[PDB]
Amino acid sequence: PICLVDGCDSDFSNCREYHKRHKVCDVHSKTPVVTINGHKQRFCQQCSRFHALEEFDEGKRSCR
Amino acid sequence: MPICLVDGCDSDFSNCREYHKRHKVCDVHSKTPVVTINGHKQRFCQQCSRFHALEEFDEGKRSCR
Amino acid sequence: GAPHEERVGDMRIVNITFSDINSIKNFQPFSQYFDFTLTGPRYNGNIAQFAMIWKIKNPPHNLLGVFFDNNTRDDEDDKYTLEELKQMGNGAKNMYIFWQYEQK
Amino acid sequence: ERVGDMRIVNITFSDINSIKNFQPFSQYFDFTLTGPRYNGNIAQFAMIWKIKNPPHNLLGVFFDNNTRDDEDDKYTLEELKQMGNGAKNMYIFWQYEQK
Ligand SMILES: [Zn+2]
Ligand SMILES: [Zn+2]
Ligand SMILES: [Zn+2]
Ligand SMILES: [Zn+2]
């Protein structure tokens, strides 16, 4: 439906059900740093959920 | 209707499959080298799943030439 | 055929997998050769409706049947294993082997 | 058949609709997508990444564990066989044909 990222300007026209179901657009699913409610997060590839940026080491796509 | 065309065959089709019912031959007579249908000598051709006269088969063959 | 498919001479071996035997009842054009009243996987000695009736010997537990698409072969219960049947196409160009899916 | 500790499992189906009764595969497929896809992770509808230059009758690729680079039209089927990244099984789904 919508992306949880602050002020995200994405229509889910060019996104797959995977993205829609996990509330993240295609761009922000890989963006290394995004903000949700003002807090730095990253969309974990392993979990398919956002976590606080502190749960990741440097550039890792997935949490530690 | 399970039937065997072979003269005198009173098979109950106990050992027979749908294949045998559909082709009007019991399991025994589907393989017998020589059977009689209405007094005529025949063999149940494996390739065709039909009876033919014996002259359509070569020496001891399950299927017509 | 697919890149991984085994061949014996000129006969392609096609392994098709199903959720269970009842899915094959809807699989045209092969369902017409099965005999769904029978227990244990069968192979066909010839081409005809319901022709898959001969009991495969010592079959793998998830094997559901074997269909040769042409020609004839010896037609007996509990005589030939699956591996031996792969040598008995006798001119068939495709040997379809039907399997029940299983995880391990 | 095997790359490292990963088994390559080719599975051939009667039709694509049949996959819907296969678990665990059905939850990872997205039947609205055109062209065979692979998953970069484990999640509902995760098989979304377009396999590059796919062979005739390939329906999809499912890696049963771990994560991998996740991009459209970048990796061929042969390249994906090197990308298990710890998965124990790579399932390759095919549409049967009569030759
Ligand atoms: Zn977004
Ligand atoms: Zn995570
Ligand atoms: Zn009889
Ligand atoms: Zn004949």
Numbering used by the authors:
A (entry chain B): 99 to 162
B (entry chain D): 98 to 162
C (entry chain C): 32 to 135
D (entry chain A): 37 to 135
Task: Reproduce, without paraphrasing, sentences from the article in which this PDB structure was first reported.
Specifically, SAP05 folds into a tight globular structure consisting of a parallel five-stranded β-sheet (β1-β5).
In addition to SPL5, SAP05 can also target plant SPL13, another member of the SPL family that plays an important role in the juvenile-to-adult vegetative transition and the vegetative-to-reproductive transition. By X-ray crystallography, we also obtained the complex structure of SAP05 with SPL13, structural analysis indicated that it shares a conserved interaction pattern observed in the SAP05-SPL5 structure, highlighting the evolutionary conservation of SPL family recognition by SAP05.
